[PDB]
Every structure is written in C-alpha cells, then in structure tokens.
C-alpha cells in the first residue's frame, strides 16, 4: 500500500475537513509525537520501536479526526502496539503509568475512567487503519549505512551523523514522514547537517568534485526536494 | 486490494473446521466474490491480557516477510462483525487467510490407506528441511513442528504452515526466549528441562520426530505430562547425562525432571528396519545435546538428502 501523500491532501486531512485549522493540528501532530518519544524513552525503548509508534500516529489521523480521537490515548495505543512489532512489547499497565506520570490531570482525563479499555479498545480501529502493515523502516538504518560508507575526518564525519540524528528525531513532530520514504528524509538530513557545519559532503566520497553526491544511495532525487525537507526542519526553530 | 482488515468475514462463506492450529481452530472457507478456497485462523482480541495477541503479531510480521515454496502463503486479513456505531463497543475478531492445501501430513499416516516409499519420505524430508533452513537463515524459529502443521498437494509439494509460535532469534547473541514451545510430543529435552536460551535446534529435533513417525505411522514419543515425556525420550535416545551433553547441569529441571533410570541410547536398534541411509539422518536429529545437534543446513548436506533431486517427483496415490 502506500503511505505517502501531497502537501495538497496533508492540508485536506480528515481534521482539516472538520473545521480545525491547519495551525493547531499541526500543533497536535507535534503534542502527539513529543508524547511518544517522551513515554517511549522513559521505557526504555529502541530508536526503531518509538519511531514506528509515531508512524503510526500520523498515518492514524490521515483516515481519521482529532475531535473523534484523543491524540494522547491515540499516541498510548501506538506506542503500545509498536512495541509488540518491534519485539520490544510493553505492558500496557505500564504505559499508562508513565503517560499520567507526564501528562496532567487534565490531559491526562483523556483516557476517561477506565484507561486500560480505553486503548485496549482503539487497538481495533488502528490495526484497521494501518491496514495491517506492521513493517515500518525509518532513516536511522540508512542514516548509518550511507555514512559509514564515507572516508575521511572521523571527528567531522561523527559530528555530521550526530546531527542528522539529532533531526530526524525533529522530523517526527511534522508530516515528512508522510511525505518522504526514509531514504529520502537520511539523505535529507545529511543534506542539512552538511550546511550548517559547513561541511563538503561531496568530498568524502569516490567522486569528490560531483556535487550530487548523494546519487550513489538514492536515485532521482533533485536538490529542490531536499530544499523543500530542509526548511521544514528548520520551521521547527524559528517558533 | 491493499486494505486489508476493512473486509468484513461474511465476504467469506465458512464451510467447516478442518483441525486445531496454534491460537484456535482452523476453518475451511470459499470466497464468496473469487470462489477460491482458503483456510482461516481466527485471532481473539483478550482486551485484559495485551490486547491484540503477539503471536499473532509475529506471525502476521514473519508470513509477509517470506515468499518460499515450502511454506504457507497469508493471502489476507479479514474482519469479524461490522463495529456497533461506538467502536468501544465491538469486540469481534480477525481471520487470517491462508491458501489452502489439498492434505496435511496428519490425515495421511492415520489413514493406514496410504503407504509412503522411500522415495516420498525422501521428497517430504527434502522439502521440510529447505523450507526450515530459510526460515532459520532469516533467523526465524517455528516454535511448534508438528504432523497437522504439514501440508502437502497433489502435485507433491510440501509446505510449512501454523507460525502462531514463531519469533525472530539473534543469531550472533544468546537471548532469552519463551520455553512452553512446542507440542510436548514434539518437544526436545532442553525445553522440558527448562531452557530459556535455546537454539534453532529446537525445530530440528520436531523434524527428527517427524522423519521417524513417516516410517512407524504414528508418534515416537506420546505422553501426557512433562515428566512421562522426557522419561519415553530417554528410553530410546538416552538419559539426559553430562557424559552426553555436559551442559545440562546449567538447566533448571535437570535435578527435579529426572527417568526413573539412566537408559542407554537404543536408537539405532530400534529403528533398523530403517533404511541405513536414513538411519544415520535420525540419529543425528534426535541427538540430546542441541549443540551437537545437526542444523538445518547440515541434513541437506546428508547421504539421505544430498541426492535427492526434487524434480521428477512421484507422490503416492490415495484417490476417490
Ligand atoms: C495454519 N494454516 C493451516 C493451513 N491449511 C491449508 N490447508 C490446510 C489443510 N488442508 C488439508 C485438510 N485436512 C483436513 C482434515 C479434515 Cl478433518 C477436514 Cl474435514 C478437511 C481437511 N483438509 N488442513 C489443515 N489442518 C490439518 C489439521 O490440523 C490443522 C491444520 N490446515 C491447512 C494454512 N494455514
């Protein structure tokens, strides 16, 4: 099946047709992903295993509404069933124990009175939603494998793939991986971890005067697009 | 076409229950739209044990993961009744879709109208282990061999099925696993000793069981408890002792679970009538120690498998 929309259709998403505007969804979006990585974490979760959870949040709200569904239970759910994929299974008691440790009282009244049912429950309609389509890859695997193809400064090489990582995990919180496959979006923050360390990415490979160089790992990909993924990663900062 | 789950199971025309898989009963169904045949297994959702069971999980993961000849292909997932207008409310199930097969391996050897040569043994035992050795490469594990988890069509081709057990191992790290695997007259010592972290030879010694049930035409070790089942398995392949397999004193039931006597390994006199080329196969995958134990790998490299080319295959007829 595939998973990758327009910026036409991410500004028609199932909220967007009831009435809420494009600034507070997106707002939710990055709420629902932020919860996520923060319970994810506080559990002690795989990179790969909090990454599939939020994949699964943003591909939940493209069928359907927030005014349907709480973004946190929502968020819980994936969370819960992510680790079952991954072979990282949590217990949902524990989930719940972590949400209400972060969320307030107030948020956290989300979950109604029972909390366990409440996810038990949305299990049904999210494994519907997905389709059943549990495997989800995410630009880390290929984030490492196309740097560590790259010779040259151990330090500067380092440095870049720390910061590429540092924003792919920024890339969560917005649509991109509703836009992009995840090679696109490894390339993409190689493409920018190389700007602002003024770094020459180009010359650490087998052509060092080739200035695209990333055609040896993903093919077809013009530079405007890696622009375009860029300046939504650094709209994460001016706010 | 792609969005599986969204079909509802009255789209589904269920015929009958055709035996007993891993997390319930299998059904026998025609597709109301395609008229093709399928087999379902339904999937229960516990809502106060997990949810959506793993197992389920894993085997949905694993099966859409794997395109083999000797294994069973999941052609969809379908949905039980249409959700109360307050999804909060259904509490249905799913069914996986299978293609169905036209026998399974168990129905053939309690039937008594059938016979196997040594030529079907040799084509079943080849395409059995072909299709555990991929699986093992892939670092799968099955976690539940078994005669009725074998199928077999017309045109001779074997197939693997019922991955309701399965998971992934790490094969360059030794990890803990789940230790009730395994239908107890398939299961190897080491799991009834108590072995958290165990190998892939666990699926091996099923196969060893299954190689020497097509000879006898029923179960080499059948009993109804843990302890009645390592005691039937030391009677023919030997007490689990230090001498033959020096780490069991790492295993937790060594000291609880021990036969009544520390019995010999009479395995290869009570199986001679055995083909000798044979012979030397089983009592390599029926060896207590899982890691002297012969892989996946190794029995296609045996005298009994090396040479026995598939195509050309001659399956024995049980007609009309
Ligand atoms: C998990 N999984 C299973 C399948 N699968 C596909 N094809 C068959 C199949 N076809 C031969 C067959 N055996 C039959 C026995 C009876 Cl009593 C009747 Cl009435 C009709 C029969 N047809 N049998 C079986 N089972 C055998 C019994 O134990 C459980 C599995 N599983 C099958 C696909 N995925």
Same mark, same amino acid.
């Given at each position: 099946?595939?998973?990758?929309?327009?910026?036409?259709?991410?500004?028609?998403?199932?909220?967007?047709?009831?009435?809420?505007?494009?600034?507070?969804?997106?707002?939710?979006?990055?709420?629902?992903?932020?919860?996520?990585?923060?319970?994810?974490?506080?559990?002690?979760?795989?990179?790969?295993?909090?990454?599939?959870?939020?994949?699964?949040?943003?591909?939940?709200?493209?069928?359907?509404?927030?005014?349907?569904?709480?973004?946190?239970?929502?968020?819980? =759910?994936?969370?819960?069933?992510?680790?079952?994929?991954?072979?990282?299974?949590?217990?949902?008691?524990?989930?719940?124990?972590?949400?209400?440790? #972060?969320?307030?009282?107030?948020?956290?009244?989300?979950?109604?009175?029972?909390?366990?049912?409440?996810?038990?429950?949305?299990?049904?309609?999210?494994?519907?939603?997905?389709?059943?389509?549990?495997?989800?890859?995410?630009?880390?695997?290929? #984030? #490492?494998?196309?740097?560590?193809?790259?010779?040259?400064?151990?330090?500067?090489?380092?440095?870049?793939?720390?910061?590429?990582?540092?924003?792919?995990?920024?890339?969560?919180?917005?649509?991109?991986?509703?836009?992009?496959?995840?090679?696109?979006?490894?390339?993409?923050?190689?493409?920018?971890?190389?700007?602002?360390?003024?770094?020459?990415?180009?010359?650490?490979?087998?052509?060092?005067?080739?200035?695209?160089?990333?055609?040896?790992?993903?093919?077809?990909?013009?530079?405007?697009? #890696?622009?375009?993924? =860029?300046?939504?990663?650094?709209?994460?900062?001016?706010? | /076409?792609?969005?599986?789950?969204?079909?509802?199971?009255? %789209?589904?025309?269920?015929?009958?229950?055709?035996? /007993?898989?891993?997390?319930?009963?299998? @059904?026998?169904?025609?597709? %109301?739209?395609?008229?093709?045949?399928?087999?379902?297994?339904?999937?229960?959702?516990?809502?106060?044990?997990?949810?959506? *069971?793993?197992?389920?999980?894993?085997?949905?993961?694993?099966?859409?993961? !794997?395109?083999?000849?000797?294994?069973?292909?999941?052609?969809?997932?379908?949905?039980?009744?249409?959700?109360? !207008?307050?999804?909060?409310?259904?509490?249905?199930?799913?069914?996986?879709?299978? /293609?169905?097969?036209?026998?399974?391996?168990?129905?053939?050897? /309690?039937?008594?109208?059938?016979?196997?040569?040594?030529?079907?043994?040799? +084509?079943?035992? &080849? $395409?059995?282990?072909?299709?555990?050795?991929?699986?093992?490469?892939?670092?799968?594990?099955?976690?539940?061999? &078994?005669? +009725?988890?074998?199928?077999?069509?017309?045109?001779?081709?074997?197939?693997?099925?019922?991955?309701?057990?399965?998971?992934? @191992?790490?094969?360059?790290?030794?990890?803990?696993?789940?230790? %009730?695997?395994?239908?107890?007259?398939?299961?190897?010592?080491?799991?009834?000793?108590?072995?958290?972290? @165990?190998? *892939?030879?666990?699926?091996?010694?099923?196969?060893?069981?299954?190689?020497?049930?097509?000879?006898?035409?029923?179960?080499?070790?059948?009993?109804?408890?843990?302890?009645? $089942?390592?005691?039937?398995?030391?009677?023919?392949?030997?007490?689990?002792?230090?001498?033959?397999?020096?780490?069991?004193? %790492?295993?937790?039931?060594?000291?609880?679970?021990?036969?009544?006597? $520390?019995?010999?390994?009479?395995?290869?006199?009570?199986? +001679?009538?055995? *083909?000798?080329?044979?012979?030397?196969?089983?009592?390599?995958?029926?060896?207590?120690?899982? +890691?002297?134990?012969?892989?996946?790998?190794?029995?296609?490299?045996?005298?009994?498998?090396?040479?026995?080319?598939?195509?050309?295959?001659?399956?024995?007829?049980? *007609?009309?």
């Amino acid at each position: 099946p595939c998973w990758y929309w327009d910026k036409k259709d991410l500004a028609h998403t199932p909220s967007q047709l009831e009435g809420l505007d494009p600034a507070t969804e997106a707002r939710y979006r990055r709420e629902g992903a932020r919860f996520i990585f923060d319970v994810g974490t506080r559990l002690g979760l795989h990179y790969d295993t909090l990454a599939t959870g939020i994949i699964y949040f943003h591909r939940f709200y493209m069928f359907h509404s927030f005014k349907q569904f709480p973004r946190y239970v929502t968020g819980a =759910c994936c969370l819960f069933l992510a680790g079952k994929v991954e072979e990282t299974p949590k217990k949902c008691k524990d989930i719940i124990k972590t949400a209400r440790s #972060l969320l307030n009282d107030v948020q956290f009244g989300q979950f109604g009175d029972d909390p366990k049912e409440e996810v038990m429950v949305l299990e049904r309609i999210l494994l519907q939603t997905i389709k059943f389509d549990l495997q989800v890859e995410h630009p880390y695997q290929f #984030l #490492l494998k196309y740097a560590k193809q790259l010779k040259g400064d151990k330090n500067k090489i380092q440095k870049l793939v720390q910061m590429a990582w540092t924003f792919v995990n920024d890339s969560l919180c917005t649509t991109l991986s509703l836009q992009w496959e995840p090679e696109i979006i490894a390339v993409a923050v190689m493409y920018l971890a190389g700007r602002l360390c003024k770094f020459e990415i180009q010359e650490w490979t087998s052509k060092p005067m080739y200035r695209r160089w990333w055609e040896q790992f993903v093919q077809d990909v013009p530079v405007d697009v #890696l622009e375009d993924i =860029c300046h939504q990663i650094l709209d994460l900062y001016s706010q | /076409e792609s969005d599986w789950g969204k079909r509802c199971v009255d %789209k589904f025309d269920i015929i009958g229950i055709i035996g /007993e898989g891993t997390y319930g009963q299998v @059904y026998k169904a025609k597709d %109301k739209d395609t008229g093709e045949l399928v087999a379902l297994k339904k999937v229960r959702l516990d809502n106060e044990k997990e949810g959506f *069971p793993i197992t389920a999980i894993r085997e949905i993961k694993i099966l859409r993961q !794997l395109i083999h000849r000797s294994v069973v292909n999941m052609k969809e997932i379908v949905t039980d009744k249409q959700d109360a !207008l307050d999804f909060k409310k259904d509490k249905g199930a799913f069914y996986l879709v299978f /293609e169905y097969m036209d026998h399974d391996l168990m129905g053939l050897l /309690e039937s008594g109208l059938v016979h196997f040569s040594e030529d079907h043994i040799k +084509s079943f035992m &080849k $395409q059995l282990m072909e299709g555990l050795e991929y699986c093992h490469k892939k670092n799968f594990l099955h976690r539940d061999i &078994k005669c +009725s988890n074998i199928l077999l069509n017309n045109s001779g081709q074997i197939k693997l099925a019922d991955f309701g057990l399965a998971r992934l @191992y790490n094969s360059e790290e030794s990890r803990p696993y789940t230790n %009730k695997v395994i239908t107890l007259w398939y299961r190897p010592p080491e799991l009834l000793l108590g072995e958290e972290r @165990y190998t *892939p030879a666990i699926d091996v010694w099923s196969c060893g069981c299954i190689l020497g049930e097509l000879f006898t035409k029923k179960p080499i070790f059948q009993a109804n408890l843990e302890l009645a $089942q390592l005691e039937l398995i030391s009677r023919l392949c030997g007490s689990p002792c230090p001498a033959v397999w020096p780490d069991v004193i %790492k295993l937790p039931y060594f000291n609880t679970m021990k036969p009544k006597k $520390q019995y010999r390994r009479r395995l290869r006199e009570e199986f +001679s009538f055995i *083909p000798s080329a044979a012979l030397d196969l089983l009592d390599h995958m029926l060896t207590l120690d899982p +890691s002297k134990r012969c892989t996946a790998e190794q029995t296609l490299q045996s005298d009994f498998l090396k040479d026995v080319e598939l195509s050309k295959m001659a399956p024995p007829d049980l *007609p009309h």
